Amino acid sequence: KETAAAKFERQHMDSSTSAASSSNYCNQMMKSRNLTKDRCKPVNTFVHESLADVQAVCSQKNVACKNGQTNCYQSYSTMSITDCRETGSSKYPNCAYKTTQANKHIIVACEGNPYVPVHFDASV
Numbered sequence: 001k002e003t004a005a006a007k008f009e010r011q012h013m014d015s016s017t018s019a020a021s022s023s024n025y026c027n028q029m030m031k032s033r034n035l036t037k038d039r040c041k042p043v044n045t046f047v048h049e050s051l052a053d054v055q056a057v058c059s060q061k062n063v064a065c066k067n068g069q070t071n072c073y074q075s076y077s078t079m080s081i082t083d084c085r086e087t088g089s090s091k092y093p094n095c096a097y098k099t100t101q102a103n104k105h106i107i108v109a110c111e112g113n114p115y116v117p118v119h120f121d122a123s124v
């Protein structure tokens, strides 16, 4: 029974690499973090910042979530992120992803005690 917070770190945290590495970064990471285990997840963002820095976003700019809830927060500063999007020539179980390194503000949804990120909403 993985916690939502643990799931968040699994699906979005990559503090090892400070920037999107190889052109094959997404193909490798999406596979390794078990994101293509029963479906190719269409889009996934990895954050290359410390866990503490990302957790801090939960006490930063409160903004509306794409779903209407209000437990979302935007980082005051931009962070190093890598967007992984599925390519059309991608078919389960041979999932294929386009890698995209960027520096943007991230928006996460937080929950619990402690108040930690559990969902990645968007980057701006």
Ligand SMILES: Nc1ncnc2c1ncn2[C@@H]1O[C@H](COP(=O)(O)OP(=O)(O)O[C@H]2C[C@H](n3ccc(=O)[nH]c3=O)O[C@@H]2COP(=O)(O)O)[C@@H](OP(=O)(O)O)[C@H]1O
Pocket (backbone or CB within 6 Å): 003, 004, 008, 011, 043, 044, 045, 046, 065, 066, 067, 069, 070, 071, 072, 109, 110, 111, 118, 119, 120, 121, 122, 123
């Ligand atoms: N306000 C909220 N909005 C959305 N979810 C919320 C909210 N508050 C709490 N949650 C809860 O957080 C857990 C993880 O959310 P989930 O969408 O499953 O994962 P993700 O990694 O964010 O995966 C998401 C984000 C990722 N994604 C999307 C866009 C992008 O730029 N990058 C990226 O990684 O793609 C997926 C689809 O994008 P979308 O739902 O925004 O359309 C869930 O709980 P459980 O799975 O434990 O039941 C959920 O109920």
